[PDB]
């Protein structure tokens, strides 16, 4: 059920990110409408600037969380598909890559990890040969639906909103401002 | 036919290493027998010591060449078995690994490498799992006899005799010594 929980967590993260962008855009458009108005309302303009910038920070945080969740679910799907395919064809890969992986026993696990490296370079060569052959690759039909829903990569809007970085001090003052925003809107 | 060529190269290299080591053993035995005798043979002792040194250098070079040939033939066997198994199960590999390798041909070199590293380390955890549960490993059916002949690892007499790390100047002066010794034994 790990795949299902990863998938629906990614789904609700996507929904939350869309909602964050929705009221960010709404706040921006009504703020520029207020700017176009004849009313001075200097305090109104300042606190709208505060609202829109904290909403931008919240949108960035939501986009980062969604990107992390998408990466996590993609990694989990890769792990499960590689694992059950590996169980399906363990003997084939074993026979193919044995001359360095034979006789694992224990060997202090220090000669064996460098042997694993000396086998994974060969696996990298295998993938290079496959990819130079250049056939068409499709998703695994066992769990292709969830991967198609989440897509190959996060949307361009997410990465565009996650370009800039924030210092820890900025992060915690932003969290405090978000908490005060929630407190004031609750009342 | 490259695998057979590598196998016969390894065979003749190890035969040359064996003949070098037995010649060195005979030379050292003759030197110690002469030393045990009462004959002065000061110049004879010096030239026998020179023969011992050049035979030791030749044994080291032969052991290094045999180790290199064994590594080369093992790598060739890895490549051949890998190619056969991968032509067998390319579709299965693609289905298992797809969620992280789509559209590589249009990706730039940076994206190329970043995708290759993720493929390699995903295969890394896959191999760690296989090696963790760890069943009994055997040779590939097609090339079992060659692996039996060459062995999983080179003999300890090869590895312990290649730990001198002679400098290049030592290498070429010893080559000159071997050349002049061959010239004078021919006469």
Author numbering:
A (entry chain h), B (entry chain g): 4 to 190
Sentences from the paper on this structure:
In complex II, two hexameric ρ rings are bridged by five Psu dimers that connect ρ(A) subunit 6 with ρ(B) subunit 2, ρ(A) subunit 5 with ρ(B) subunit 3, etc. We further refined complex II (ATP; global resolution 3.8 Å), complex IIexpanded (ATP; global resolution 3.6 Å), complex III (ATPγS; global resolution 3.65 Å), and complex IIIexpanded (ATPγS; global resolution 4.25 Å). We nevertheless retained these peripheral subunits in the final models. ATP or ATPγS are bound similarly between all neighboring ρ CTDs in the ρ-ATP/ATPγS-Psu or ρP167L-ATPγS-Psu assemblies.
Phage satellite P4 polarity suppression protein, Psu, a building block of the viral capsid, inhibits hexameric transcription termination factor, ρ, by presently unknown mechanisms. The ρ hexamer adopts an NTPase-inactive, washer-like, open-ring conformation until NTPs (preferentially ATP) are engaged and RNA is bound at the SBS, leading to ring closure and RNA entrapment inside the ring.
